[PDB]
Chain length 114, copies 4
């Protein structure tokens, strides 16, 4: 139901071994840890959640971009990249969060399919 894909705009490659933390907003407006992992050699992170657990609500996907750039020896601007969105039940729908990283910039999009 939820996949993350991360690309590197400097090297033209998947962004490999990037830590990704997913949080769900709780009733008291705090961010509860939900799922996490590291991107694969294809820049993808699968297996974060299941349809049973991924209920409607507000989610935050935090991509640890600073550590990624530092491990490449490159000085980055952002602490991390944060993608915050609402999951809404609207028929069967898979969410892909994609991010394209540069040292001082990033782009993110959602691919939501049935």
């Amino acid at each position: 139901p939820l996949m993350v894909k991360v690309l590197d705009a400097v090297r033209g490659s998947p962004a490999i071994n990037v830590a990704v933390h997913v949080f769900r907003k709780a009733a008291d407006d705090t961010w509860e840890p939900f799922a996490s992992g590291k991107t694969s050699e294809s820049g993808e992170l699968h297996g974060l959640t299941t349809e049973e657990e991924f209920v409607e609500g507000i989610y935050k996907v935090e991509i640890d971009t600073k550590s990624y750039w530092k491990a490449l020896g490159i000085s980055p601007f952002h602490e991390h990249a944060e993608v915050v969105f609402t999951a809404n039940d609207s028929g069967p729908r898979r969410y892909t969060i994609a991010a394209l990283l540069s040292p001082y910039s990033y782009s993110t999009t959602a691919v939501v399919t049935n």
Copy 2:
């Protein structure tokens, strides 16, 4: 020392009347409100802070993209766009945070000058 510029990729226009909230991480690791404003007819937000008040720190620039799209009658994907960065850690700099918005995507970059 801190300016925000927001563009609309659907209309090919400045993103006008976008609310922007800036936070600064406090010594107890909470986000403290630091400044806020709205983008002008040119999509720019000036006057958020002064060189005196804009000390070293970790800052979060929250661009209220959902309220922007909904005020135009559009249901967007993201709750907001969040830009988090350490500022002024090598002395005062001037920061422009630019964002380019679509209903399911956004790109952000920083222009940092001395």
Copy 3:
């Protein structure tokens, strides 16, 4: 060796049935048709070429964005999106050209892997 992936930033979806034309630069500096097709329901276009035919050289990938937006009833800015690059033999390497489309903007990146 060469794949094209096209995403829609307005709808948060693959860009389906987008015409894509690939050209190779000829010795007289003209653009010779090389391969073409339409993106699938996943926004992907596979099978454009083979390793035997995809020799080093300058290539142009033209994505017919204007017709895509017009078929959705949306007025776009660009005539098409053009991605021009050199293919260089540098060990075994697959090229993915990705593009993320909005009516007045697009982003493109290359994912080049072994």
Copy 4:
């Protein structure tokens, strides 16, 4: 009536000294040279044309990204970034073409005002 702004996503700076060539499609369907210039210290290129000369037409704004990256000692992916659009077909407009550059990626948008 036509301005070009170019930013560097690796350095977080204006892209300075970027060559830009503008073409206009002629009645015989060839690209005729129309104007050219280079971006300034602020990453902006002004003065390309006048309201009198900038008639209706299909225009191509070629941003010489490869020479930019190579002059900085970097081997980039794309030959250039090409922005192709019909202009002034509903009367004179002011066009800003903005581009945000990385070695393997770029994003471009247009700001069109009346």
